[PDB]
A paper describes a structure:
Here, we seek to establish the direct reduction of formyl phosphate into formaldehyde through developing a new-to-nature enzyme, formyl phosphate reductase (FPR). We identify promiscuous FPR activity in four enzyme families and present one homolog of N-acetyl-γ-glutamyl phosphate (NAGP) reductase from [name] (DaArgC) that produces relevant levels of formaldehyde. The [name] active site can be divided into three parts, the NADPH-binding domain, the catalytic site, and a substrate-binding channel. The catalytic site consists of catalytically active C149 and the HRH motif (residues 208-210) responsible for binding the phosphate and carbonyl group of the substrate (gray labeling in Fig. 3a).
Numbering used by the authors:
A (entry chain A): 1 to 334
B (entry chain B): 1 to 105, 115 to 334
Write the structure that this text describes.
Amino acid sequence: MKVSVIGATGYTGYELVKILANHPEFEIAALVSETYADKMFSDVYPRLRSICDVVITGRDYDAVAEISDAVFLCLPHAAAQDAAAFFYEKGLKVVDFSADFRLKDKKLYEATYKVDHTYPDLLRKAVYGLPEIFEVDIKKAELVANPGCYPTSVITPLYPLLKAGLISPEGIIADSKVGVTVAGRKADIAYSFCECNEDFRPYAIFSHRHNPEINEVLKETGKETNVLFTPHIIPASKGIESTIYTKTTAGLAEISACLKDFYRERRCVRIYDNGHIPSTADVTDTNFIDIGLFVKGERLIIVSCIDNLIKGSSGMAVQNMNLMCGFDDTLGIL
Amino acid sequence: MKVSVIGATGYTGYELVKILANHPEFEIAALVSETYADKMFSDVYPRLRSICDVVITGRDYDAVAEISDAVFLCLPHAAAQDAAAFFYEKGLKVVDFSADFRLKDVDHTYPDLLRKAVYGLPEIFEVDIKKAELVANPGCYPTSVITPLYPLLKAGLISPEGIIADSKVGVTVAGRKADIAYSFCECNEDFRPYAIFSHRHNPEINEVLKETGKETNVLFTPHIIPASKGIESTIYTKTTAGLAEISACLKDFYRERRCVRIYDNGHIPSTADVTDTNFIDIGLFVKGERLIIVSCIDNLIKGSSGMAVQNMNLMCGFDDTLGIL
Ligand code: NA
Ligand code: NA
Ligand code: NA
């Protein structure tokens, strides 16, 4: 099966190509980048020399659609909508890395971006690609909205606890931290080495687009949540750690059993209830999500770690494409 | 004036010696590091070659008392108690870096001395520090949390309940220790929480905040940054007041304290803004009934050695920012 990557020279595209080169079913057709067209992919990433030397092509979406059965969209806001619309109408399967199709409520989209959605009819066909929760919907999908990296680390541990009513839906605080790769492959001074090295900073206080995504997805548990989310930048390349504060009516063993029962068949989910504390190094360069549970009285603290570029992006995207194409979601990953 | 440093070769003593070398009134008499005795301080830290070449001496506390008017104790627990008792009985001013004398409330060896100890947060308890002989230096984490919270609780502009402090520190928090958990290869590119529900600084924060008359139950969770220095504390509180009144309460309380830099305009402090300085940067953000405070310090300076020089300045009748600003 032929797949193409639009915006292939970014960091999410690099991590995607690494997985795709070893995937037993997906064959790389085209890698699209206007900046690096006509260059080999290994010219941009010499680490992949002799592993993936595919010549990068420009944004000729017509030629891409003729040689591809499915497409990964590693494109920024708005540009992702245009590409998703084009390749969807050509009959291809589409995984969109952007946030543009994650909020199915148009009024919530407009509340977040202050503008209308450009393809509202296409929006109603998008499925939220959190593979360990919405697998049934994803298998029936043609357009998948790849979840955000932060929401992946927060929704995954919270969803089964709220569904079973073991924690309060009110007052949840998610204090999350990410490596600099969250910005993507950018030349801006804000993401230069000398500005980011040795620096740790919060950002997007009261205003990050992932906050509405988190609360809108947790609605599906039947509980209305008002999760407060605050992101931070780590002076490291990759990794997310989310320290999540909740109120609980259950103890450590009951909370642990709820999470381990819900994800019993999911080999990418590693849950700890023995005092082990996950860190970003435990999940960097893997597709795992590590969840640590800690209970004192009526307070539950969850530590949730992922590689933002893999389980938070490209690895989760391969899981979604696997599900849409009838394969096991972990095929080519584990 | 003559001052000495006990346990001077740690990172806190390193930052302390940097300040003392350029201090107009404090004159270094002895730098005590027992594992490094008979080496020059610049042998351990070559950056200070030609700046502080003082020969490190051993554990001769009688000799230190002979030549010193005051002493900084950068010692671990228990050892800090004995040294603090010795130099107090000899009539010296003492700033203890450890936690042995912070909490006025496994029994304390010197309980009568504990009652004389003053909690050395210079911008809050300056009145009591000017009259003290023994000052307990606050911890680095509590300094970043207590400073923005104390005026708001005292004015009743935030709720004392449900406060959450999610704090992050560079690896220098561990000190100059031989330990695999603090090696470069184990800490590089890694970010981790630790001491969940169990860090010793959590009780310190709540005990000091009681002085406002409000009973707090701050929940504090620390994290290790893959960087050398800096603390960032994201503090979550509930409030019914506006940003203007929260901002005005903090700026009025710290009006003449030049090391406190308070922002209310959307500026977000970061650890790079305060690293290698004695400043504490505080950013204020209000949406509805939620106040988010961003508090940053250098954990080795404003969180430790710089704050200690403020406390020693105050005890010695000097301006608290002397030798710092
Ligand atoms: Na680093
Ligand atoms: Na782990
Ligand atoms: Na900054």
